[PDB]
Write a protein that binds this ligand. Structure first.
Ligand code: A1BIN
Ligand code: CL
Ligand code: CL
Ligand code: CL
Length: 305
């Protein structure tokens, strides 16, 4: 099968994926030359997920920051999803900036993440896998080159009925699903996740960007279940003011606020964005869209990685 073309119009190119969440490739539409990301998944697999992820992109189609889904089908023993190709993740740019983002970069990146997560909630979905690895910027020279995007909805769940807007019932004793570094306290306790838990996870990412690390990283334990327990115990023990030591206090006020939200309550997204925006007014900075990674390699941007 020389010159492998999947989905009729998509030329398989360069591998950029992992071995756990299906291998991901670069691609080129052979009709118009637009780049795409092509994600493979074994057909007869123990965890089928790529079909519902295709329907999540179609559900969120038209949202600023959600890539377009172009094709989904079966080819051989693989399910194939084709979406827009995007740039590095905020975790990638984090590593390239010395594993520390400036206050101005964190604020501007935060208000775009709150808008993305809000748009997800608007369509009756909760993300439940908030992490900097899944927030991607655009490609070079594009109009949305430095805008934040959201991908990978394998953990997305419907939290309310699309017709009546009846919130999902609250339950407990759930299996811990997610990355323990950012998941909310309620997720450590096995509680059903809702809109408030996507925002508390964002607050953990904000302190992660500002400090360079979280005090519950590098925690050791004999098993993984007890390691998730130690991390969750440090999160309740550490007040938001302690996390915010030396930082603008609006980030601690944000984390405490989203931790106090009722289970089924609609969070004040715009009030949170205005809260993080007042940081720039307190520091005499403008929200002009200038980011730290835009100064890499001599005011040039990232390269070769
Ligand atoms: F269909 C899909 C679904 C998800 C993905 C995807 N997962 N993912 C996970 C990361 F950690 C980083 C990046 C990344 C991508 C991605 C998307 C677009 N452009 C480049 C990379 C690609 C195709
Ligand atoms: Cl579930
Ligand atoms: Cl960790
Ligand atoms: Cl680089």
């Amino acid at each position: 099968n020389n010159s492998s073309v999947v989905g009729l119009h998509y030329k398989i190119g360069k591998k950029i994926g992992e071995g756990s969440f299906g291998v991901i490739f670069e691609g080129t539409n052979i009709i118009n030359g637009v780049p795409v990301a092509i994600k493979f998944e074994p057909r007869k697999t123990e965890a089928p997920q790529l079909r519902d992820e295709y329907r999540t992109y179609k559900h969120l189609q038209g949202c600023d920051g959600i890539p377009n889904a172009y094709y989904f089908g079966q080819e051989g023993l693989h399910n194939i999803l084709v979406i827009d190709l995007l740039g590095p993740s905020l975790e990638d740019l984090f590593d390239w900036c010395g594993r520390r983002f400036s206050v101005k970069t964190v604020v501007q990146v935060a208000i775009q993440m709150l808008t993305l997560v809000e748009e997800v909630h608007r369509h009756d979905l909760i993300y439940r896998d908030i992490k900097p690895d899944n927030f991607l910027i655009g490609r070079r020279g594009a109009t949305d080159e430095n805008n934040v995007h959201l991908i990978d909805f394998g953990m997305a769940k419907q939290y309310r009925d699309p017709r009546t807007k009846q919130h999902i019932p609250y339950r407990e004793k759930k299996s811990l699903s997610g990355t323990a570094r950012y998941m909310s306290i309620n997720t450590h306790l096995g509680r059903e996740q809702s809109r408030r838990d996507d925002l508390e996870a964002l607050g953990h990412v904000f302190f992660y960007f500002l400090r360079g690390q979280l005090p519950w990283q590098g925690l050791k334990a004999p098993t993984n279940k007890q390691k998730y327990e130690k991390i969750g115990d440090k999160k309740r023990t550490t007040p938001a003011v302690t996390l915010c030591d030396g930082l603008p206090q609006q980030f601690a006020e944000y984390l405490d606020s989203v931790r106090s939200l009722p289970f089924d309550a609609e969070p004040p997204y715009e009030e949170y964005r205005m809260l993080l925006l007042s940081v720039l007014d307190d520091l005499g900075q403008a929200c002009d869209g200038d980011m730290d990674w835009m100064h890499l390699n001599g005011g040039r941007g990232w390269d070769a990685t």
